[PDB]
Amino acid sequence: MRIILLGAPGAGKGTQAQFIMEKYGIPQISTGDMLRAAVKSGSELGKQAKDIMDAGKLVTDELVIALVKERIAQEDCRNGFLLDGFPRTIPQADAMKEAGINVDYVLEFDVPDELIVDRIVGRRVHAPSGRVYHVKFNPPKVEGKDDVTGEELTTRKDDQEETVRKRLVEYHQMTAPLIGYYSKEAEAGNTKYAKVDGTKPVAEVRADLEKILG
Ligand SMILES: Nc1ncnc2c1ncn2[C@@H]1O[C@H](COP(=O)(O)OP(=O)(O)O)[C@@H](O)[C@H]1O
Numbered sequence: 001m002r003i004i005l006l007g008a009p010g011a012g013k014g015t016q017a018q019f020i021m022e023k024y025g026i027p028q029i030s031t032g033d034m035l036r037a038a039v040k041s042g043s044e045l046g047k048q049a050k051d052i053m054d055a056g057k058l059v060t061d062e063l064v065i066a067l068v069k070e071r072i073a074q075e076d077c078r079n080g081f082l083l084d085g086f087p088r089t090i091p092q093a094d095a096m097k098e099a100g101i102n103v104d105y106v107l108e109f110d111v112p113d114e115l116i117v118d119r120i121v122g123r124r125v126h127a128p129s130g131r132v133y134h135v136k137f138n139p140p141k142v143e144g145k146d147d148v149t150g151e152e153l154t155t156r157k158d159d160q161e162e163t164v165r166k167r168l169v170e171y172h173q174m175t176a177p178l179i180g181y182y183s184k185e186a187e188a189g190n191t192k193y194a195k196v197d198g199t200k201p202v203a204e205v206r207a208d209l210e211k212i213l214g
């Protein structure tokens, strides 16, 4: 089972990415996570991303499509995967079509622009695993520590009001058009489209997803 998460920044795609992963098995492919790992481990394929990311700008299609093509490669993704943060553009979406990468479901996480700044300013992550918390809306069992390894949590470098603003716009310019893209795919029968209310409580969106899938 292949799946795509599609939504504004802070819409809770990642938070939902974890669940589907542990409950269905399929690995979670988060471009942003890979970019941040690579940027930190100084990998050759990704380290370049650094300045762009911290600016709020999207990274060049070519670099990202590569990474994804390299990760889907792994044998863990032979039974399905979860593209969480990709595609982010028509080119990127197009590139997947030619490569013959079909998805079973496309899930649009609907969340208002006004809700975004506050979700994001209070988001903390366990970088090593990408596990994502929120100091108020979905905190850790122990303040400042990852629930599975007890490791200190951190705040993302690009998680600041200003950068979130720049981030929202690009979303509206480049990514947003994709809702239309997959709507059309869904209409042709190529995929299954599903919008869900991302303002609801985590535990609740979780159940909506479970209704949509199985
Ligand atoms: N459904 C929700 N309601 C309230 N807060 C949420 C919800 N889902 C996620 N969050 C919190 O919002 C922040 C951003 O969500 P995240 O899952 O990181 O989304 P995205 O991956 O789309 O940016 C995190 O701090 C997260 O714990």
Ligand SMILES: Nc1ncnc2c1ncn2[C@@H]1O[C@H](COP(=O)(O)O)[C@@H](O)[C@H]1O
Pocket (backbone or CB within 6 Å): 009, 031, 032, 033, 035, 052, 053, 056, 057, 058, 059, 060, 061, 064, 084, 085, 086, 087, 088, 089, 158, 167
């Ligand atoms: N699929 C992508 N296409 C282009 N840029 C991306 C992509 N995914 C992640 N990035 C970069 O990763 C950063 C953080 O994305 P995220 O962690 O998914 O919110 C963005 O600010 C972009 O610069």
